[PDB]
Design a protein around this ligand. Structure first.
Ligand code: PEE
Ligand code: PEE
Ligand code: HEM
Ligand code: HEM
Ligand code: WF3
Ligand code: BOG
Ligand code: BOG
Lengths: 380, 101, 146, 61, 48
């Protein structure tokens, strides 16, 4: 047997070996706080989602009103609804920084942890996609219509997969009910895979800002990082709540306060902020199929980063050239975001094609190149 | 002329690891060759490197750096590991080539 | 013994004129430092919170035999006199000591140990292959809650 | 010396510490709520139903 | 369009105060624990 029941117990040993005695680098910065936030966020989305699902009705004649009934009649239903929709945003803000950090500090060298990370991203994106359709407003319907319609651009198997996915000839009730089911389901898969994510991670342990072995200076996750993570939570949570409670409709499209109508196409069909950059890249390539492929790759490109690392150093902490290139990339993304919210007209169309072009260029050409160049400047 | 030398010393300073007291070699990502190279280091060089690293990690956690005086100078950076690393790679390639044909 | 925690350990109450050090010292293999420290601090907390009259009864008998053993020969009796005068300004006989010792009971030990041990910031010295023992903070939390 | 007193009476034993947190919460709630509503209402003098209520509450028809 | 308007703002107010209060306290706590590492000093003493 073992003296303390935290080491021997098949369950308390688990809570312990991953949240209490777990060896963590003594110097990980606040950019290492997002993993826990992502987790907490996930548990939060699930809780508020269940609460909402208990008053929802997956039917085209009742969806829009069931949500209105929830906000108007359910005790604190409005608050739960606010937290859920805005929670999805927080979720993405957190996930984008999580990724950024990983790109900057070369965490992707932990390939399995990284590849499962990508799968989590995709699952989260599909989840928000189906979830967005549920209130059944105008943007819910046209977003669903426009996007799922891209698959018919695939060869042969296309025109089919679409009418199979819709369960009919157009986005209609059968599509709605199957979307509720998927939205209710995917989050659990996310939780599932998140477990796998943390398992692979624990093999190696966390990376750290200098990118050098932290074996000479490890510290117990608790109280160091439990306190640091809890603080990081409250710090983020304040703006989340502030924006949520004081400017509820800041992020939302007003076109969604109008019940879906198949006979009235909205003037400007655009996604929530977190999908804008991808929308921009989608529209950058005029040709239904090539635009689809460009969108696909805009995210699937993440599976390649691990292979385009040429530097002899792990992070960018000591690589000034890569740093600016990195911030160029970040700024490249605000631009695509902005473009994604603008109509398809000059000068936006060309600015858009450029930003897309630069996006893939920076990741596939410049980064690997500058890394090589940098090794020679260190005489390596 | 001295172009390459000016560039090199420029980058070296731009990089900034010397501000933590790290030697260029202390910053190498530990892939397999480097892992092996380190195992071949003499006890003293190994322990000196170990302290330098633990020292940088402590500065990093503190969000501080070394006093300008203590920064490693470009021409005083001892490339202690490069000789070993180059050999480890020399051997590996030999084995690799030999196992093909 | 059960878990092979250490090669040895000892408690000590090193007194001085105006201060002192009350602690313990152990020697153990690199991979059992944690558990030993854990079990040790454990026993300290047991002292402040649950000492039994059975434990004290025996402790006193062990302490009596110990004080008598410090007077086995002329050199050790001389050492006692030299120190007693120098530290207590007089000599304290075995007859007096024993009286003091007999006065101690569970209740008393708990209160005295709580007074000097419970929730205090200890001093720690570690030498050798000490990687498995870690964080003052963790050691500090070991100073409270039985 | 409250810090000293508080530490010996409230923060010493984990048992009294938790008991303190509870009564602390109980008292803090009651107080924080009143003060909060008081601030909110004062900031909105005459706009709430509470205010204009007298005009139709048994004072009409 | 939004009957909760007033309650929503009354809450936002309470959320802010508690948010300020808590973020503060947790900041101290975090700093207090980390103080052990922030002030820590070390030296290299080879048998040289
Ligand atoms: C994708 C969709 C895009 C939507 C917009 C996302 C939000 C964009 C807001 C920009 C972020 C502003 C943050 C400013 C941070 C300023 C700062 O401190 O930078 C310098 C600082 C210096 O650190 P060291 O080099 O280690 O030196 C140590 C010595 N003490 O650098 C860092 O903190 C590391 C950078 C990590 C943060 C990255 C966040 C950017 C996020 C964008 C997403 C990018 C990834 C691509 C996603 C594809 C899908
Ligand atoms: C009004 C309603 C009245 C009723 C409420 C009853 C509440 C009862 C709560 C139990 C009291 C806790 C007692 C346990 C004491 C254990 C302990 O050591 O303290 C916790 C211990 C402190 O350690 P020491 O300072 O070393 O203490 C040593 C003292 N000798 O751990 C901590 O850091 C505690 C601080 C926790 C802060 C976490 C908050 C972060 C989250 C913020 C958002 C809010 C939450 C919303 C809930 C979501 C639910 C869906
Ligand atoms: C459901 C979403 C996700 C959750 C719950 C999650 C959770 C975690 C947690 C808790 C950590 C450890 C602490 C930290 O460093 O932040 C972690 C680390 C990591 N995650 Fe994620 N993650 C998510 C998505 C992703 C994504 C999208 C990527 C990248 C494509 C990713 C890449 C990584 C990597 C590489 C690490 C290593 C960090 C390091 O030590 O350098 N994760 N993640
Ligand atoms: C990874 C977690 C999740 C994400 C990213 C997420 C995201 C979303 C999004 C973006 C919407 C639309 C919000 C809006 O009205 O603008 C939504 C709505 C909804 N979600 Fe989720 N959700 C998640 C998990 C869940 C879970 C677990 C359930 C069910 C147990 C759930 C139930 C619902 C319901 C009922 C709606 C419709 C009512 C409404 O529009 O507010 N969600 N979700
Ligand atoms: C049911 O449609 C839901 C949309 C949404 O914003 O969800 C939060 C929405 C609304 C209007 C226009 C477009 C969308 C969805 O857009 C996307 N939705 C995507 C969903 C999953 C993945 C992997 C990529 C996606 N890319 C996009 C892109 F913006 F690039 F078009
Ligand atoms: C119970 O609480 C009350 O609920 C009302 C709404 O139901 C709010 O308008 C009040 O401000 C709030 O105190
Ligand atoms: C960061 C966590 C902040 C939590 C803040 C809790 C304050 C919410 O408090 C709410 O205020 C309303 C208006 O008076 C009341 O009607 C609700 O019953 C009450 O729960």
């Amino acid at each position: 047997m073992a003296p303390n029941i935290r080491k021997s117990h098949p369950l308390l040993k688990m809570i312990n070996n991953s949240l209490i005695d777990l060896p963590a680098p003594s110097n990980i910065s606040a950019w290492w706080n997002f993993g826990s936030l992502l987790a907490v966020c996930l548990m939060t989305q699930i809780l508020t989602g269940l609460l909402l699902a208990m008053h929802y009705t997956a039917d085209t004649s009742l969806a829009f009103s069931s949500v209105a009934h929830t906000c108007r009649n359910v005790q604190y239903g409005w608050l739960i609804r606010n937290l859920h929709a805005n929670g999805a945003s927080f979720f993405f803000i957190c996930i984008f920084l999580h990724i950024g950090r990983g790109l900057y500090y070369g965490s992707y060298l932990y390939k399995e942890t990284w590849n499962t990370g990508v799968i989590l991203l995709l699952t989260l994106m599909a989840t928000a996609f189906v979830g967005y359709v549920l209130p059944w407003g105008q943007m819910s319907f046209w977003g669903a219509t426009v996007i799922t319609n891209l698959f018919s651009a695939i060869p042969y198997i296309g025109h089919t997969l679409v009418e199979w996915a819709w369960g009919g000839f157009s986005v209609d009730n059968p599509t709605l009910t199957r979307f509720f089911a998927l939205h209710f389901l995917l989050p659990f898969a996310i939780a599932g895979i998140t477990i796998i994510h943390l398992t692979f991670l624990h093999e190696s342990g966390s990376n750290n800002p200098l990118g050098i072995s932290s074996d000479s200076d490890k510290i117990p996750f608790h109280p160091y990082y439990s306190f640091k993570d809890i603080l990081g939570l409250t710090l983020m949570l304040t703006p989340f709540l502030t924006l949520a409670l004081f400017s509820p409709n800041l992020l939302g499209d007003p076109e969604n306060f109008t019940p879906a109508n198949p006979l009235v196409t909205p003037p400007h069909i655009k996604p929530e902020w977190y999908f804008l950059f991808a929308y921009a890249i989608l529209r950058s390539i005029p040709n239904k199929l090539g635009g689809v492929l460009a969108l696909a790759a805009s995210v699937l490109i993440l599976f390649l980063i691990p292979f385009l690392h040429k530097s002899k150093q792990r992070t960018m902490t000591f690589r000034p050239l890569s740093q600016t290139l990195f911030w160029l990339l970040v700024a490249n993304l605000l631009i695509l975001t902005w473009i994604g919210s603008q109509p398809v007209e000059h000068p936006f169309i060309i600015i858009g094609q450029m930003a897309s072009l630069s996006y893939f260029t920076i990741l596939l050409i410049l980064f690997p190149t500058i890394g090589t160049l940098e090794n020679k400047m260190l005489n390596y | 002329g001295r172009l390459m030398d000016r560039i090199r010393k420029w980058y070296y300073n731009a990089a900034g690891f010397n501000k933590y007291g790290l030697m260029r070699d202390d910053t190498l990502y530990e892939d397999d060759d480097v892992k092996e190279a380190l195992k071949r280091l003499p006890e003293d060089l190994y322990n000196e490197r170990m302290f330098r690293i633990k020292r940088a990690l402590d500065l990093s956690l503190k969000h501080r750096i070394l006093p300008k005086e203590q920064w490693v100078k470009y021409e005083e950076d001892k490339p202690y590991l490069e000789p070993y690393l180059k050999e480890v790679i020399r051997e590996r390639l030999e084995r690799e080539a030999w196992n093909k044909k | 013994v059960e878990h092979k925690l250490c090669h040895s350990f000892q408690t000590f109450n090193t007194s001085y004129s105006d201060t002192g050090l009350f602690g313990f010292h152990f020697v153990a293999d690199p991979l059992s430092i944690d558990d030993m420290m854990f079990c040790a601090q454990g026993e300290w907390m047991r002292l402040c919170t649950s000492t039994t009259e059975s434990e004290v009864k025996r402790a006193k008998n062990h302490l009596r035999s110990a004080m008598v053993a410090q007077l086995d020969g002329t050199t050790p009796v001389c050492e006692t006199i030299g120190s007693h005068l120098l530290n207590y300004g007089r000599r304290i006989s075995l007859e007096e000591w024993d009286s003091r010792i007999s006065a101690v009971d569970a209740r008393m030990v708990r209160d005295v140990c709580s007074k000097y041990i419970y929730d205090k910031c200890p001093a720690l010295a570690a030498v050798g292959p000490i990687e498995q023992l870690l964080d003052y903070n963790r050691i500090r939390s070991g100073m409270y809650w039985i | 010396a409250l810090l000293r007193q508080a530490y010996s009476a409230l923060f010493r034993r984990t048992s009294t510490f938790a008991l303190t947190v509870v009564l602390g919460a109980v008292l803090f709630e009651r107080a924080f709520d009143q003060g909060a509503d008081a601030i909110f209402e004062h900031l909105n003098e005459g706009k709430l139903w509470k205010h204009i209520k007298h005009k139709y509450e048994a004072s009409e028809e | 369009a939004e009957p909760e308007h007033d309650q929503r703002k009354r809450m936002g107010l309470k959320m802010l105060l508690i948010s300020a209060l808590l973020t503060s306290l947790l900041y101290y706590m975090k700093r207090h624990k980390w103080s052990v590492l922030k002030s820590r000093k070390m030296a290299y003493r080879p048998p040289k």
